[PDB]
Design an enzyme around this catalytic site. Structure first.
Site, mmCIF file in Angstrom:
data_model
loop_
_atom_site.group_PDB
_atom_site.id
_atom_site.type_symbol
_atom_site.label_atom_id
_atom_site.label_comp_id
_atom_site.label_asym_id
_atom_site.label_seq_id
_atom_site.Cartn_x
_atom_site.Cartn_y
_atom_site.Cartn_z
ATOM 1 N N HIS A 177 -11.179 -28.965 24.136
ATOM 2 C CA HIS A 177 -12.035 -28.367 23.127
ATOM 3 C C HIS A 177 -13.491 -28.560 23.556
ATOM 4 O O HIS A 177 -14.116 -27.626 24.076
ATOM 5 C CB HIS A 177 -11.672 -29.006 21.786
ATOM 6 C CG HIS A 177 -12.485 -28.554 20.623
ATOM 7 N ND1 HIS A 177 -12.277 -29.074 19.362
ATOM 8 C CD2 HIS A 177 -13.492 -27.657 20.501
ATOM 9 C CE1 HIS A 177 -13.123 -28.515 18.512
ATOM 10 N NE2 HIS A 177 -13.872 -27.653 19.177
ATOM 11 N N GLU A 208 3.581 1.980 2.550
ATOM 12 C CA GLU A 208 4.686 1.029 2.507
ATOM 13 C C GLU A 208 5.622 1.262 1.308
ATOM 14 O O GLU A 208 6.708 0.708 1.260
ATOM 15 C CB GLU A 208 4.150 -0.413 2.518
ATOM 16 C CG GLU A 208 3.308 -0.746 3.778
ATOM 17 C CD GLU A 208 1.940 -0.041 3.808
ATOM 18 O OE1 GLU A 208 1.282 0.114 2.763
ATOM 19 O OE2 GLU A 208 1.487 0.361 4.885
ATOM 20 N N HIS A 222 -0.481 -3.214 4.904
ATOM 21 C CA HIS A 222 -0.891 -1.830 4.755
ATOM 22 C C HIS A 222 -1.749 -1.305 5.909
ATOM 23 O O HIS A 222 -2.943 -1.615 6.005
ATOM 24 C CB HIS A 222 -1.655 -1.631 3.429
ATOM 25 C CG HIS A 222 -2.154 -0.235 3.251
ATOM 26 N ND1 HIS A 222 -1.310 0.858 3.242
ATOM 27 C CD2 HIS A 222 -3.411 0.259 3.149
ATOM 28 C CE1 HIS A 222 -2.027 1.962 3.117
ATOM 29 N NE2 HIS A 222 -3.303 1.627 3.055
ATOM 30 N N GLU A 253 -4.664 -10.071 3.043
ATOM 31 C CA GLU A 253 -3.699 -10.155 4.129
ATOM 32 C C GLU A 253 -3.782 -11.408 4.997
ATOM 33 O O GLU A 253 -2.764 -11.823 5.567
ATOM 34 C CB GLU A 253 -3.760 -8.882 4.978
ATOM 35 C CG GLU A 253 -3.303 -7.636 4.205
ATOM 36 C CD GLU A 253 -4.369 -6.983 3.351
ATOM 37 O OE1 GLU A 253 -5.516 -7.492 3.252
ATOM 38 O OE2 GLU A 253 -4.047 -5.925 2.774
ATOM 39 N N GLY A 293 0.838 -1.185 0.000
ATOM 40 C CA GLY A 293 0.000 0.000 0.000
ATOM 41 C C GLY A 293 0.874 1.235 0.000
ATOM 42 O O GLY A 293 2.112 1.142 0.045
ATOM 43 N N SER A 294 0.255 2.405 -0.021
ATOM 44 C CA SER A 294 1.053 3.610 -0.220
ATOM 45 C C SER A 294 1.946 3.945 0.962
ATOM 46 O O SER A 294 3.040 4.495 0.754
ATOM 47 C CB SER A 294 0.194 4.795 -0.629
ATOM 48 O OG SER A 294 -0.720 5.092 0.390
ATOM 49 N N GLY A 334 -7.685 -23.083 15.704
ATOM 50 C CA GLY A 334 -8.921 -23.534 15.091
ATOM 51 C C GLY A 334 -9.478 -22.581 14.047
ATOM 52 O O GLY A 334 -10.595 -22.775 13.580
HETATM 53 C C1 LIG Z 1 -12.565 -18.147 10.826
HETATM 54 C C2 LIG Z 1 -13.493 -19.232 11.279
HETATM 55 N N1 LIG Z 1 -14.837 -19.130 11.040
HETATM 56 C C3 LIG Z 1 -15.687 -20.124 11.459
HETATM 57 C C4 LIG Z 1 -15.186 -21.236 12.121
HETATM 58 C C5 LIG Z 1 -16.140 -22.322 12.544
HETATM 59 N N2 LIG Z 1 -16.010 -23.627 11.894
HETATM 60 C C6 LIG Z 1 -15.417 -24.735 12.471
HETATM 61 S S1 LIG Z 1 -15.451 -26.104 11.578
HETATM 62 C C7 LIG Z 1 -16.343 -25.324 10.437
HETATM 63 C C8 LIG Z 1 -16.795 -26.104 9.224
HETATM 64 C C9 LIG Z 1 -15.735 -26.288 8.154
HETATM 65 O O1 LIG Z 1 -16.351 -26.975 7.062
HETATM 66 P P1 LIG Z 1 -15.423 -27.800 6.055
HETATM 67 O O2 LIG Z 1 -14.134 -27.090 5.832
HETATM 68 O O3 LIG Z 1 -16.205 -28.045 4.807
HETATM 69 O O4 LIG Z 1 -15.086 -29.182 6.800
HETATM 70 P P2 LIG Z 1 -16.077 -30.315 7.382
HETATM 71 O O5 LIG Z 1 -16.478 -29.871 8.759
HETATM 72 O O6 LIG Z 1 -17.270 -30.454 6.451
HETATM 73 O O7 LIG Z 1 -15.227 -31.561 7.422
HETATM 74 C C10 LIG Z 1 -16.612 -23.980 10.717
HETATM 75 C C11 LIG Z 1 -17.378 -23.027 9.839
HETATM 76 C C12 LIG Z 1 -13.821 -21.318 12.381
HETATM 77 N N3 LIG Z 1 -13.298 -22.332 13.051
HETATM 78 N N4 LIG Z 1 -12.994 -20.325 11.938
#
Ligand SMILES: Cc1ncc(C[n+]2csc(CCOP(=O)(O)OP(=O)(O)O)c2C)c(N)n1
Ligand SMILES: Cc1ncc(C[n+]2csc(CCOP(=O)(O)OP(=O)(O)O)c2C)c(N)n1
Ligand SMILES: Cc1ncc(C[n+]2csc(CCOP(=O)(O)OP(=O)(O)O)c2C)c(N)n1
Ligand SMILES: [Ca+2]
Ligand SMILES: [Ca+2]
Ligand SMILES: [Ca+2]
Ligand SMILES: [Ca+2]
Ligand SMILES: [Ca+2]
Ligand SMILES: [Ca+2]
Ligand SMILES: [Ca+2]
Ligand SMILES: [Ca+2]
Ligand code: NA
Ligand code: NA
Ligand code: NA
Ligand code: NA
Ligand code: NA
Ligand code: NA
EC number: 4.1.1.7
Lengths: 524, 524, 524
Positions: A280, A27, A69, A46, A24-25, A400
């Site tokens: 988890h 930078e 940026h 990003e 970006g500018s 995650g």
């Molecule tokens: C940035 C973000 N947004 C939402 C989630 C919530 N999330 C966890 S698993 C999942 C489903 C992912 O689906 P896919 O990649 O098709 O795999 P599958 O569960 O069908 O094996 C989501 C939306 C997350 N972990 N991170």
């Protein structure tokens, strides 16, 4: 010398030769006269820039340098920083700021209260008070990212600083060496070794910092000496142990009760390079059962202080693993017996079971392949079905946060050009950082992307089932053509609607000279 | 068990038996049923509470526990926390919060956005999300304060949490042991030892973390082996070396140019337990002269990353000092020659020169006295004139924040009942935490307070002189009767207007059974 | 022009002529060449500096300017800032920073991450990115402190900035006028007026922002027109209404249930210039009873958003009170009847009941006296027993933070030289900011300090009684001689052990030419 010249000399002298960026500018005055011995890796958004840098840093086991940026670029990268924080990734994130004379009026592109923007996902965040301070601020950023526990840092630099005269005394920064390669004092280490030698039924749990330290082989020796089963700590971001070694027991379930039950009967449990524990699911119960004591070795005070049980030692994982492996007695107990091979799931001539996909990858991929996982409903089966003999063979979003694996797979492949990278990514996850594909095409980084397409956010459907939660919206993602997306970004695209097509597509992808995306039709 | 019972059991099991506090209503449910094996030390204002706890922690070399009232109490203590941060003091600061049901409405006594209040002066700051989390949050606070680099932490607790049922699984917290007692790996330590052995003209610089670690004797052995002069790093918060040992060279001037000049000709300079460097005055020049290399051992990543020069090793000071002292060769060079005794300043029968006061203290005080310094214009002479043979013999506000020495001297005296504490405090500095005197009276803690009364903020006058700054307001503090202030808080008070009175007053104070304040008329 | 000259011209042009401070070296380049038309008011500790400035700002109804020393000075003032936040006090807090060239190395006196230090107790906190930005940053500080809702702000300035050349375009800052003197649009105001006119049994609740706005007389007119009883909102920091006016109903109890019960039967309750509500004790129940609707007028979005009930209008209190007073109909209902005079508590010839002290003050003090309250167990009786006819007649620590009244009483007396200030302060509270007495002596600011001495933290004992909390430590403060403390700081001191002595001491204090402290022996 200018601040520009001095800063690039500092970077070069500290081993940095690559800038991952989206420009970006603010930078441009940094990126101008870009050194001929540096290379710039462009990505289109990003989250992708940081994901690529993160995979590169994790695989190379060295810091990666990023240029974004201002506030909007930094902000687009903050989900990526959440993963980097959890993986202890040594990332030097720099962002350009407005010229000092217009910061107060909050001109367009001013990063307001800049140091607070990436908190709490960085070890250190800063904007210098003068141009001449920039090299010393960069020195701070380099060493803080690299010191145990490694992690991302952030430096905001007003664009007018680069052309200013540097302090000649900045030369003292160039060759500074900072070490955190430390281990427990001899007296207390001898106490620990004696406790391990005296255990009647020890167990070992390994986390991602073992793989980051390349302590894998030392942990193998340690496990063999103690004749101890070895698990990988839950929610694993990396693979710290050969998965077909006789001691290996696989991925721990990420639940309090499940883990204490698994460890029942083990009198001493030695955890190395993991938080205790990255649970988890909510699975309330005992943290440990009576008769089990836990000892944790961690590089991170923030891990040591929050364990609900056990002793802890804060030290370098590589140094501690090496010392323990070489000091413990050879137990006369029998070596643990290898886990049996997994079952073959029945597979008809239609859509693919995930188990079939992993079995086929394991059959066809080279023995030094590197896998990334962002297929969220299939992780347990992936861990059981891939023989990963070598270090640096597995990555999964450490916080995650989806959008990691696709760009990270490109950075890992850039770091390890002789090891075939295969990213297994769900159809849902693939979208978060889809534009990263372009960087693979543009630089001809020959990552293979296997899209597991079942049309749904499967892990969420499963959890909604566990909750008995009815009428949850937003769980289905029909209508995405991944071959067209790959075409959009210049990446060769294949389909696999059945097992014979899967084998044909993998054969083609493995012998291709560039990146390849395979869209696999998987069971719902 | 209740959260109250479980939390006090955790504190007891982790070695805490004293609460330094100023109470309020949000804290009553914590302080009720106060355990009979604990003691509460009341002070009248929170800067005093924290100062006393800080002196106690520094002298005892163990964490001190503090209880303050919500935001206003925490806020009154924040200058004290600035010093504690710089001294790496292990302080567990707790504050009571409103009942959870009225936090949202911002009832009176609500600590809003509580965790942000003490930042950036704490290692960790937190408010738990539920009552049952309180013991684990307290466990976090204890271990974070105590882990290298030690420092203050903050925990805010809603008052209704204490009576709630604790999680029975909190018992696993009680006996957790967390170690940061680590040192450089053998390979790299051998490299360092060889560099020290090979140096032709080594020098050693020691900072406060040496005294905190009780590494003083090991540093003496190290200096004797290397035949090396030893300085104390600038702006010294503690004394890390016997001040009449032949190797001792005194307090370093706190200036960039002054330090590089002092170190010129020394080929290897080993800094242990200090920032590099706590400069003060602006004295621009070379960080080091050609021919000098610097190696720093520090317990603090925030020290290691910001040094403008030299290598650094992040490790435990006690472990490193012991290892180095025992591994280095005995050099055949001649042992450095002791510094000459200081000159006697001419003294008439009128107001006292500070030099006279320090010479007289040195003559009359026991050899195991402990001194505190908050007489800001006289520090250089104090360092030259007091023979301090033993560890733990000197404290000075580590961030330069006045209001430390008066309360800290009480905490140090509480920690070290058999060592006479003598706080030398300017008339200006004495006011910041004047009410601390009451705690000495109330608990009969027999600290001696020597007030150096010259009617002015002398260090500021001097600096205004250096600046050639004319017409600066607010530099004079006439009209304070310190004997009356001491009477106000129940402390025996003496005067000394000349040398004969000074000797008489010191004789009386040294044989007194309680705290004593001596107001000394010093030269302007 | 220099940054120094331009900044003082900006301050002068914006009406600032006084600096409340405690100096340090980072501030000397600001304080040098101090303008002859400015005055500097020194206090001996920073809680005192800010308390004095706060009383001055609240009474003068204009911003007050403060200069503190770096982090430690700022930190010592943070409890004072907690009160200032709750009282919406327009305070411009400046602190000196290290020279820009040594900020990175964290030289002694560096304020690290300075803007985060006073958060969350300020509206805005900032350190400029260059010297030339300082005047514009000061302009920001002035206007943010002064804009509704008024409040404290913080500006950190590197000491080397002052001597640098200013931007000539900074002249445009000098005469900027910023207004927040706004009121509800005509349409919606007409709706509100009609609702008030239509109410069958309205009530009015007034908070401190009424007195800050000098809206008191308009609120009297409003209450007379509506024939409505008037209460003061709970935990009152100021007095917004004549306490012997027939409509006056006194201080509301600070409890949820108590307030809804008090308002039962009132169909429309109009709250002006108060949070809804600053509850204190936990007194769960209905926020309002059926049949009561609440409408709040507040200058503060942070008040409007957090009310648990009622409508709100965010606007200037002075403008809204004036508009409402002049637009509402004259109700034909009977004017409320004045509260009866309070009972005389039986008083023997020994220690004084607080009720006796307030009755005697009311008898003897001038009708335009100004009272401050930090006698925490006696507030309800104080509110019933002092006839306060005029605006600006009462101050109480707005966040409940002790250490306010003693210094604030000096600032109020400086602001209002023709009105006798009488601070009624408990023996416990008196210690927090005891050194403030010196400033009264030094500048001959003739505040009267009445110390209510009962030897204990009485409000806490009472609350411990309510809790049935046994074995609470730290509730007693025996052994303080307040006459000696006053002597220590140069303030005339009197005692009153009985009623005849109280009257004699008050007569003497009222005719004195300087500050006077009276230590009153009150009942336990
Ligand atoms: C940035 C973000 N947004 C939402 C989630 C919530 N999330 C966890 S698993 C999942 C489903 C992912 O689906 P896919 O990649 O098709 O795999 P599958 O569960 O069908 O094996 C989501 C939306 C997350 N972990 N991170
Ligand atoms: C909390 C705080 N406020 C202000 C300062 C600035 N300060 C540094 S030295 C000094 C003068 C102290 O005077 P005194 O204690 O009488 O000692 P002298 O300089 O006369 O020897 C002051 C006010 C500070 N360091 N800390
Ligand atoms: C800075 C601060 N510390 C502690 C408290 C808690 N507190 C509330 S009332 C009180 C007692 C004050 O005693 P005193 O001034 O003698 O008045 P009394 O209650 O006896 O009438 C205390 C310590 C507080 N509000 N603010
Ligand atoms: Ca943020
Ligand atoms: Ca197979
Ligand atoms: Ca899916
Ligand atoms: Ca803060
Ligand atoms: Ca002598
Ligand atoms: Ca002095
Ligand atoms: Ca009367
Ligand atoms: Ca009292
Ligand atoms: Na050792
Ligand atoms: Na089958
Ligand atoms: Na080793
Ligand atoms: Na002489
Ligand atoms: Na209108
Ligand atoms: Na009676």
């Amino acid at each position: 010398a200018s601040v520009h010249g001095t800063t690039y000399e500092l970077l070069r002298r500290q081993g940095i030769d690559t800038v991952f960026g989206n420009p970006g500018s603010n930078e441009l005055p940094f990126l101008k006269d870009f050194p001929e011995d540096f290379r710039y890796i462009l990505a289109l958004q990003e989250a992708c820039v940081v994901g690529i840098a993160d995979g590169y840093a994790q695989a190379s086991r060295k810091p990666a340098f990023i240029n974004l940026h201002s506030a909007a670029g930094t902000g687009n990268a903050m989900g990526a920083l959440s993963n980097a924080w959890n993986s202890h990734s040594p990332l030097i994130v720099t962002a350009g700021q407005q010229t000092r004379a217009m910061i107060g009026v909050e001109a367009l592109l001013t990063n307001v209260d800049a140091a607070n923007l990436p908190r709490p996902l960085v070890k250190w965040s800063y904007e210098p008070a003068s141009a001449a301070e920039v090299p010393h601020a960069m020195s701070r950023a380099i060493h803080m990212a690299s010191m145990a526990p490694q992690g991302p840092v952030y430096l905001s630099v007003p664009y007018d600083d680069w052309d200013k005269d540097a302090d000649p005394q900045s030369h003292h920064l160039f060759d500074r060496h900072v070490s955190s390669s430390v281990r427990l004092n001899d007296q207390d280490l001898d106490i620990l070794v004696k406790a391990l030698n005296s255990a009647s039924n020890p167990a070992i749990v390994l986390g991602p910092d073992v793989d980051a330290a390349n302590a894998n082989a030392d942990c193998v020796m340690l496990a063999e000496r103690l004749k101890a089963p070895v698990w990988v700590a839950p929610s694993a971001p990396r693979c710290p142990f050969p998965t077909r070694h006789p001691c290996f027991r696989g991925l721990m379930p990420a639940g309090i009760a499940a883990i204490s039950q698994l460890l029942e009967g083990h009198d001493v449990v030695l955890v190395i390079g993991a938080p205790v524990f990255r649970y988890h699911q909510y699975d309330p119960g005992q943290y440990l059962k009576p008769g089990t004591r836990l000892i944790s070795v961690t590089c991170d005070p923030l891990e040591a202080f929050r364990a609900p049980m056990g002793d802890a030692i804060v030290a370098d994982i590589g140094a501690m693993a090496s010392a323990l492996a070489n000091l413990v007695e050879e137990s006369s107990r029998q070596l643990p017996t290898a886990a049996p091979e997994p079952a073959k799931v029945d597979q008809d001539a239609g859509r693919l079971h995930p188990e079939t996909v992993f079995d086929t990858l394991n059959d066809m991929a080279p023995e030094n392949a590197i896998y990334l996982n962002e297929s969220t409903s299939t992780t347990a089966q992936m861990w059981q079905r891939l023989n990963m003999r070598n270090p640096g063979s597995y990555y999964f979003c450490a916080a995650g946060g989806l959008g990691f694996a696709l760009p990270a797979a490109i950075g890992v492949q850039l770091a390890e050009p002789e090891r075939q990278v295969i990213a297994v990514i769900g159809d849902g996850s693939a979208n978060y950082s889809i534009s990263a594909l372009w960087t693979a095409a543009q630089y001809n980084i020959p990552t293979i992307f296997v899209i597991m397409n079942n049309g749904t956010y499967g892990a969420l459907r499963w959890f909604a089932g566990v909750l008995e939660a009815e009428n949850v919206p937003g769980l289905d993602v029909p209508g995405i053509d991944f071959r067209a997306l790959a075409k959009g970004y210049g990446v060769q695209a294949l389909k696999a609607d059945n097992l014979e097509q899967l084998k044909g597509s993998l054969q083609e992808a493995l012998s291709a000279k560039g990146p390849v995306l395979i869209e696999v039709s998987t069971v719902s």
